[PDB]
């Protein structure tokens, strides 16, 4: 069963650094990890805007072909809308992509993997693991 | 067969003003209109943060129940990442949701219907129409 949604920052850091602690978690949770298509979009932008687009696209494609990319669907959208509104009212917003990811993970009952605990801590109903 | 993807601006305007000319366009184009789930997120947020949330949710709900809402999927993500890269290359600002909606539409060969032509006009490969 899917259990974990990797935030974009974790993906970038893993791509750039291939860290041991992450590799261990990846292997422990093979087939239980996904990203949101919102993250895919950011990673494709990173690749295409870089000095080595072809090279970097292939690295990304290899990353995403080993996990699941989930569609940002109607329930993701609703739950994201609801969270945004709660955050506005409390004056502690989160960046636009991050809000979507948290809303997506929220709608699917998934744990967000992030090093940005301070930021993500404050999103209602969120479950977090830092794999660094 | 879907032809038009309504941008967030056109949806907000339509909801707030209930304009006669849009009603005629809608009736003529039933079952050829859609929104992105990105726009759904923005409408729910707008409802939920407003001074009459339950009431505004119901208006939003009746609006979206009458057209198709498309999931923002892997092809939408990829098309969006490409577009963001070409816009960066040209130092042209477009907002984050507008970009996703333009990528979404472009991934499905759709015309974007928008009353903010100036923002969308500089996206390469755009097809746009203004219904206001």
């Amino acid at each position: 069963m899917l259990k974990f949604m990797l935030d974009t920052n974790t993906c970038i850091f893993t791509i750039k650094n291939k860290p041991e602690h992450i590799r261990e978690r990846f292997n422990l949770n093979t087939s239980r990890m996904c990203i949101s298509s919102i993250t895919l979009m950011e990673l494709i932008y990173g690749a295409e805007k870089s000095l080595a687009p072809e090279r970097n696209l292939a690295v990304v494609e290899g990353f995403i072909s080993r996990l699941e990319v989930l569609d940002y669907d109607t329930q993701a959208a609703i739950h994201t809308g609801q969270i945004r509104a709660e955050l506005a009212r409390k004056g502690t917003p989160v960046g636009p992509y991050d809000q979507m990811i948290a809303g997506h993970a929220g709608s699917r009952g998934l744990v967000v993997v992030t090093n940005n605990l301070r930021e993500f801590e404050r999103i209602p109903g969120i479950r977090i693991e830092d794999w660094c | 067969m879907l032809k038009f993807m309504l941008d967030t601006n056109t949806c907000i305007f339509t909801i707030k003003n209930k304009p006669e000319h849009i009603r005629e366009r809608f009736n003529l184009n039933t079952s050829r209109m859609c929104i992105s789930s990105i726009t759904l997120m923005e409408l729910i947020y707008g409802a939920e943060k407003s001074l009459a949330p339950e009431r505004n949710l119901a208006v939003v709900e009746g609006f979206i129940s009458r057209l198709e809402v498309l999931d923002y999927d892997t092809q939408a993500a990829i098309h969006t990442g490409q577009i963001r890269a070409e816009l960066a290359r040209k130092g042209t600002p477009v907002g984050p949701y507008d970009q996703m909606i333009a990528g979404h539409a472009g991934s499905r060969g759709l015309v974007v219907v928008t009353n903010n032509l100036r923002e969308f006009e500089r996206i390469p490969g755009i097809r746009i129409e203004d219904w206001c």
Partner: peptide, 28 residues
Amino acid sequence: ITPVGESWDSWFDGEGASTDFMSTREQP
């Protein structure tokens, strides 16, 4: 029996991204 993709180690051990790749993320 759980379906699995290619191994994670084969990716982690692959040659990676160029140095400039997303040195910044760019979230508005």
